[PDB]
Each structure stands twice: as C-alpha cells, then as structure tokens.
Design a protein around this ligand. Structure first.
Ligand SMILES: Cc1cc2nc3c(=O)[nH]c(=O)nc-3n(C[C@H](O)[C@H](O)[C@H](O)COP(=O)(O)O)c2cc1C
Ligand SMILES: Cc1cc2nc3c(=O)[nH]c(=O)nc-3n(C[C@H](O)[C@H](O)[C@H](O)COP(=O)(O)O)c2cc1C
Lengths: 205, 206
C-alpha cells in the first residue's frame, strides 16, 4: 500500500497532449482546489489565488500568449496560480486563527508581533520570494491531487504573464506564479530523467 | 477505494513538531526519499536543488539553538536542509545532460539552449532566487509526501537563522537556503488542516 502510494507519486509527469473533448467538471475542480489547499505555507498565510479558465475560445487567446503551446488550448481547464502580496496581513491572520479556535486573542496578538519582526528582517518572505515558495508548495500538491481523479497536467512559465493579466483583468498585486493546464492525457508523459542523489545531496553523520 | 485512499494519503501530510528522539531513519531510506523527491518538476528540468541531511543529534542540538530553540530540530531522525543553487541554471550542463541521457539531439540542444537563454533574458528572476524558491518548493512538497510513504513525518521551516546555519555547516555562498525540514517518527499527530475555503481564494470562469 505504501508501494502503491510511492508508485502513484512517481506517476506524475508533464503531459502536453490532452483530449480536447474531455471535460473537467466544476465540482471536481472545487475538490481538487480544496485538497491542494492542504499544502503548507509560512504561518499558514495561504497566499495562493487561483483563476481557472474553462472556455475554449479564451484558452485559444491564452495559447497566443503562451508561445502557441498547444496544451493550453486542448486542456479541459487552465489553472492560473498567483501569489497575493497582500495575503501577508497580520489582522487577517489573527482573526482567522482565533475564529477557527486555533489560538486565543492574546496568543494571536503576541504571535503577530513576532511575525512582524520576522518580516522586518526578512522582507523577501512577504514579497515574491515568499510567494514563489508558498505557491510552489500548493502547485506541487495540486499536480498530485488532479491525478487522483484521472487527469494530468503540465506546469508552465514560458508564457507572457504580463499580457495574460491584462487579458484577464487581474489585480496588479497578484504575482503570476504558474500556468497549469489540466486535462485527460492522450499520450503519457516521458520517464523521469534526473541527476542522481549522490550528485545533489550530502548525508552527514 | 483507490481514489479515496490516494486523497487520504495526500491529505495526511501535516506539520509534526513532536518526534521520537530514539527513532532511527536508515540512510538507505534517506537516499530513497531524495531519489523519489527528485522526480519533482522544475523549469527546463534544471533541478536546482541541493540538499544536506544532518543525522547527528549533537549537531542537531547546535542547529536547534539557531532555530529559536524549536525542539523538533533536535528530536528528529534527520534534518533535511534544502538549498537552491543559482549556478544550476547552466546552459552548457543542460545540453550535456539531456544529450547524454538520449532525451534530445545535440543540435536540438543548442537550439533549445538559445530559446532558454532568450526566456531568461526576459525573466532574469527565474534564474535567481525567485526561480529557486519555486523549483525547490516543488521538490520540498514532493519530499514531504514521499517521507509519509515510509511512515515518517516532517515540518517545513524558515523560522531559523539560515546565515548562522550556513556558517555552522560550512555551506557554499552560491547556495540559497530555501527550507529546513526535520523528518522523524511522530510522537503526537498533526492537526486537521485549517484553511480558507476554495471560494475565498479561487474563481472558475466558463
Ligand atoms: C516553473 C516551471 C516552468 C515550466 N515551464 C514549462 C513550459 O513553459 N512549457 C512546458 O512545456 N513545460 C514547462 N515546464 C515543465 C518542465 O519542462 C518539466 O517539469 C521538466 O522537464 C520535468 O519533466 P516532468 O514534469 O515530466 O517530470 C515547466 C516546469 C516548471 C516547474
Ligand atoms: C516556508 C514555511 C516556513 C515555515 N516555518 C515554520 C517554522 O519555523 N516553524 C514551525 O513550527 N512551522 C513552520 N511552518 C509550518 C506552517 O506553520 C504550517 O505548514 C501551517 O501552519 C499549516 O499547517 P500544516 O502543515 O499542518 O497543514 C512553515 C511552513 C512553511 C511552508
């Protein structure tokens, strides 16, 4: 069963050939997003914002902004993952965590000052560098979750995100992180080729 | 059935901060964990992650002092330090690696390399910390799921002094610290995930 889970995880590869007639229903999209959201993030700020485009005409427009990569138009839905800098809001953080019964109002106020002091020293963790890590965690989770339902994906950045935001009238404070076309594979992805563990990792005892 | 089990497994990834200080994580498994985590995607398959795994309680106690005395650093079976190396975005390597592995032709490599250069020219951040954070973040999440397969748990961390840690371990300067990940056998279960609802962060347009 652990072997089944390992084989499942190993099965994620980029798929770029999707069935243009396959449908990804909104009920499953919502479930996929809910499960993806269980990804960790610094202080549980959950800075991800997602816009799912499920309309072929519009995906064709997006393909024109994505170096004409075909998967953008054949996919059942194109998930656009953004990070919101304004997500690192300490008033929201206190309210949310107290309302959910995780911590008291006093504990939340004290923790919030420590988080402020941290960001004061490490401003990048509440800017694009922070967002890229937090939304990257989310994205990897989403890529495994969509597969539970029989779908596949390909993560993408070789696209004109400035033009995409303008096309979709996106807030200027939302930083584009990744475009993720999701669909039914017509062709399996290729086997993983990677550098060995000995080439990138050191174990010290 | 199958789908329920896979979802339950993914959902089971949770932050664990109470580990069994006597539990041993064998090195064969550490290597297996890193091999499977490596299957994570990265832009152009540059795989810019570098990892140092500290499995030595004496050293972990020193690391705990540099991690605001968070106890999980010292009780864990091993502490996985994940870095990104910006030197990894090297077009010579990229060609050599993909041609030697039979993924693409030599001439196709030179052509692809130039398109990769063009892309980085437009978006230089993607070969710098912004790119590393994303690429190593993908690896990190994959690692966190993989450790669960073997009955272990983890907690991702940045509330530590990465500057002092790099110095304590004699790490290269070109390596950007991304995340500290203690891994061990849970003595206490993680909490159910508390999250904003899908409608609070996502829109579906048809
Ligand atoms: C940040 C990022 C950007 C990527 N950009 C694209 C892209 O624009 N087009 C594409 O076809 N693949 C893109 N990829 C997919 C990678 O090429 C792919 O993950 C890598 O070659 C490893 O293959 P695998 O995903 O099949 O394991 C991107 C991946 C990441 C993580
Ligand atoms: C970048 C990052 C940094 C984090 N820093 C810490 C940390 O220093 N200490 C800690 O106990 N947890 C840390 N966390 C864990 C988060 O608090 C945790 O993921 C979040 O509260 C959600 O809980 P969950 O992982 O159990 O779902 C960090 C997580 C991320 C992604």
């Amino acid at each position: 069963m652990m072997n089944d889970y390992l084989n499942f995880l190993d099965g994620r590869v980029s798929v770029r050939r999707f069935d243009p007639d396959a449908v990804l229903p909104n009920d499953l999209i919502k479930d996929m997003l809910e499960h993806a959201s269980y990804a960790p993030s610094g202080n549980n700020f959950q800075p991800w914002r997602v816009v799912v485009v499920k309309n072929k005409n519009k995906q064709e427009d997006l393909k024109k902004l994505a170096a004409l990569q075909p998967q953008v138009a054949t996919a059942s839905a194109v998930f656009l993952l953004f990070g919101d800098e304004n997500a690192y809001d300490l008033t929201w953080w206190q309210e949310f965590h107290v309302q959910k019964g995780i911590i008291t109002k006093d504990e939340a106020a004290a923790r919030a000052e420590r988080i402020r002091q941290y960001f004061d020293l490490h401003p990048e963790d509440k800017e694009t560098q922070g967002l890229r890590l937090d939304v990257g965690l989310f994205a990897m989770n989403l890529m495994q979750v969509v597969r539970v339902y029989g779908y596949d994906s390909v993560p993408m950045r070789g696209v004109d995100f400035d033009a995409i935001k303008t096309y979709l009238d996106m807030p200027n404070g939302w930083e584009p992180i990744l475009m993720l076309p999701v669909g039914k594979a017509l062709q399996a992805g290729n086997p993983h080729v990677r550098k060995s563990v000995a080439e990138f990792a050191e174990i010290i005892e």
